[PDB]
Design an enzyme around this catalytic site. Structure first.
Site, PDB file in Angstrom:
ATOM      1  N   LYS A  51      -1.814  17.366   5.324  1.00  0.00           N
ATOM      2  CA  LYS A  51      -1.675  17.144   3.736  1.00  0.00           C
ATOM      3  C   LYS A  51      -2.634  16.153   3.398  1.00  0.00           C
ATOM      4  O   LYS A  51      -2.952  15.188   4.187  1.00  0.00           O
ATOM      5  CB  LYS A  51      -0.264  17.041   3.360  1.00  0.00           C
ATOM      6  CG  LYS A  51       0.407  15.791   4.233  1.00  0.00           C
ATOM      7  CD  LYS A  51       1.339  15.049   3.531  1.00  0.00           C
ATOM      8  CE  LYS A  51       2.656  15.711   3.485  1.00  0.00           C
ATOM      9  NZ  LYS A  51       3.874  15.004   3.126  1.00  0.00           N
ATOM     10  N   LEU A  83       0.720  -1.120   0.072  1.00  0.00           N
ATOM     11  CA  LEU A  83       0.092  -0.034  -0.100  1.00  0.00           C
ATOM     12  C   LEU A  83       0.888   1.179   0.057  1.00  0.00           C
ATOM     13  O   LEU A  83       0.444   2.225  -0.532  1.00  0.00           O
ATOM     14  CB  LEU A  83      -0.889   0.080   1.081  1.00  0.00           C
ATOM     15  CG  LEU A  83      -1.815  -1.145   1.215  1.00  0.00           C
ATOM     16  CD1 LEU A  83      -2.667  -0.957   2.413  1.00  0.00           C
ATOM     17  CD2 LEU A  83      -2.881  -1.100  -0.064  1.00  0.00           C
ATOM     18  N   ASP A 130       0.393  17.755  10.263  1.00  0.00           N
ATOM     19  CA  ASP A 130       0.599  17.750   9.022  1.00  0.00           C
ATOM     20  C   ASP A 130      -0.584  17.023   8.165  1.00  0.00           C
ATOM     21  O   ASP A 130      -0.884  15.976   8.033  1.00  0.00           O
ATOM     22  CB  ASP A 130       1.884  17.185   8.543  1.00  0.00           C
ATOM     23  CG  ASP A 130       2.089  17.261   7.237  1.00  0.00           C
ATOM     24  OD1 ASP A 130       1.255  17.911   6.194  1.00  0.00           O
ATOM     25  OD2 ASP A 130       3.225  17.007   6.285  1.00  0.00           O
ATOM     26  N   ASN A 162      -2.263  12.247   3.421  1.00  0.00           N
ATOM     27  CA  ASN A 162      -2.248  11.803   5.002  1.00  0.00           C
ATOM     28  C   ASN A 162      -3.625  11.434   5.238  1.00  0.00           C
ATOM     29  O   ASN A 162      -3.694  10.642   6.176  1.00  0.00           O
ATOM     30  CB  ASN A 162      -1.485  12.681   5.756  1.00  0.00           C
ATOM     31  CG  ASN A 162       0.017  12.537   5.607  1.00  0.00           C
ATOM     32  OD1 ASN A 162       0.453  11.592   5.122  1.00  0.00           O
ATOM     33  ND2 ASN A 162       0.843  13.170   6.331  1.00  0.00           N
TER      34      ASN A 162
END
Ligand SMILES: [Mn+2]
Length: 264
Positions: A122, A13, A120, A125
């Site tokens: 982003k 993954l 974070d 994520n």
């Protein structure tokens, strides 16, 4: 009893940190045939994952060490990166964005209640479960400048001490990315990007609703203490904002609200 050979590998993954994450099939036990994700770290994150229990944070199922490697068995999130949705859509309608940002906020609250900072947000994520609901999943080590820094608070970039406020910045950066198609502050190169974030000269697109503009303006602020969410109400402060006026929260948490996309 539980051990690495209780699973067979299906595919990779992703790499990241110093580990691999596999999609796996469990072949022993009541959950024979049941599908999972497995992160293998070549000898923290496990402690965070062990402590958490939220509908918008990934479930840790098994954890064990054997040989050198450390193994974390997590729920399989077939929904994929939220990133892929944004990439295909180009720009989210505010309804879409609002859904995701609302779920992320409840997850952020839960973490901050546990004294956890995500740093974070982003969109690479953010994961989605099979229904299309939000899962925060990566609490691994990777290291601050290794990847993109465009969703990180300035007080993180110039290491000067920071708290949960950095997460509300990141929510605003992500929100900006969702609504405009790129993060708030982008340079031609690395150094120019950083400087742009520190200066924090916010450019509100004229087309966004007044509510959407006002939340962005309160989230993306150089002064951490004065961000929406930086206060004692944390996520409640943010969820109070009139941008989240249509959000029935008790139902959102119950995952009774329908996600703007069903990965399918
Ligand atoms: Mn790194």
């Amino acid at each position: 009893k539980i051990r690495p050979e209780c699973f067979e590998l299906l595919r990779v993954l992703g790499k990241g940190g110093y580990g691999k994450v596999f999609q796996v099939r469990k072949v022993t036990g009541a959950n024979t045939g049941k599908i999972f994700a497995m992160k293998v770290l070549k000898k923290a994150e496990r402690n965070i994952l062990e402590e958490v229990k939220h509908p918008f944070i990934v479930d840790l199922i098994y954890a064990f060490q054997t040989g050198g490697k450390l193994y974390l068995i997590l729920e399989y999130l077939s929904g994929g990166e939220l990133f892929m949705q944004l990439e295909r859509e180009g720009i989210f309608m505010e309804d879409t964005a609002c859904f995701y940002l609302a779920e992320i906020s409840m997850a952020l609250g839960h973490l901050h209640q546990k004294g956890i900072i995500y740093r974070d947000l982003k969109p690479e994520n953010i994961m989605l479960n099979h229904q299309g609901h939000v899962k925060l999943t990566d609490f691994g080590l990777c290291h601050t400048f290794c990847g993109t820094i465009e969703y990180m608070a300035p007080e993180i970039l110039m290491r000067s001490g920071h708290n949960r406020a950095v997460d509300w910045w990141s929510l605003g950066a992500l929100m900006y990315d969702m609504l405009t198609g790129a993060p708030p502050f982008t340079g031609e190169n690395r150094k120019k990007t950083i400087d742009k974030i520190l200066k924090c000269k916010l450019n509100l697109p004229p087309y966004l609703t007044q509510e959407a503009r006002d939340l962005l303006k309160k989230l993306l602020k150089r002064n951490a203490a004065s961000r929406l969410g930086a206060g004692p109400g944390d996520a409640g402060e943010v969820q109070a904002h009139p941008f989240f006026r249509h959000i029935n929260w008790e139902e959102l948490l119950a995952r009774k609200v329908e996600p703007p996309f069903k990965p399918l």
